[PDB]
């Protein structure tokens, strides 16, 4: 039931992912 | 992005405001040093 500790690479990937998601959301709002 | 307020609306003005802020910081540092200098100058002679 413990929580896994994130690696620098994992956090990096998370940042990139959120960045992509946000930009995509902006594209969806401009397209809509 | 969570922007507290949108950036890059008026880059000239925003940069100018930053320039003013940093200038004020330099103002504070220099004024502090000058104050100490006046204190020692007065006390020593």
């Amino acid at each position: 039931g413990e929580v896994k500790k994130a690696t620098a690479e994992e956090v990096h990937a998370r940042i990139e992912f959120l960045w992509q998601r946000e930009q995509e959301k902006k594209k969806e709002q401009v397209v809509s | 992005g969570a922007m507290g307020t949108t950036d890059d609306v008026d880059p000239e003005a925003e940069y100018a405001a930053w320039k003013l802020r940093e200038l004020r910081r330099l103002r504070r540092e220099r004024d502090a040093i000058e104050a100490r200098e006046r204190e020692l100058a007065e006390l020593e002679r």
Partner: protein, 188 residues
């Protein structure tokens, strides 16, 4: 119970009152549950819209402050903090703010200065809430506050040696402002 790079104990860094207000808060129970460093990034981009300590008539601890406390709990390594600062900070400013705040809380003065001083050139707008209502601030103002003030976001900042002291012991290089170079010419 690991201790920070500086002398301080992570549990005691924030006031007992502030800790209690955070843990009792809805945002801590709802949004800080099961959270890790990547999840810290998630909560930052999702829920952080201003920097502050406890605010309002309800003395509500900010999501910012709560995530700071969660960072104290996690005690992230320097590499992850670098990820926050540079990659996260370049992309998400409030993440940089959070990282700077945490570093100021838990890193040696030399590290604090060397890490945080470059972001005095970061002029991106931030939302600042708390003392004297709600106002607009900037990243460099926040950094300056971290470097020069005793208290930030309802958190007492441990006293650091003066920068000149660190320079004299050759632990630090003199800080170079671009405006300093312009200013030398202006004063003459």
């Amino acid at each position: 119970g690991p201790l920070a790079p500086n002398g301080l104990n992570p549990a005691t860094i924030m006031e007992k009152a502030v800790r209690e207000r955070i843990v009792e808060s809805y945002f801590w129970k709802e949004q800080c549950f099961g959270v890790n460093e990547a999840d810290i990034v998630d909560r930052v981009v999702e829920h952080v819209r201003f920097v502050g300590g406890v605010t309002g008539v309800t003395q509500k601890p900010s999501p910012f402050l709560c995530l700071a406390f969660k960072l104290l709990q996690l005690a992230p390594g320097d590499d992850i903090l670098k990820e926050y600062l540079y990659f996260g900070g370049e992309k998400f400013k409030y993440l940089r703010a959070l990282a700077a705040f945490y570093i100021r809380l838990t890193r040696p003065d030399k590290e604090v200065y060397t890490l945080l001083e470059p972001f005095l050139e970061d002029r991106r707008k931030l939302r600042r809430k708390g003392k004297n209502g709600t106002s607009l601030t900037y990243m460099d103002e926040f950094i300056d506050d971290l470097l020069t003030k005793d208290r930030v976001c309802s958190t007492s900042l441990w006293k650091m040696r003066r920068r000149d002291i660190l320079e004299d012991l050759d632990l630090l290089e003199p800080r170079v402002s671009p405006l300093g170079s312009l200013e030398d010419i202006l004063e003459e």
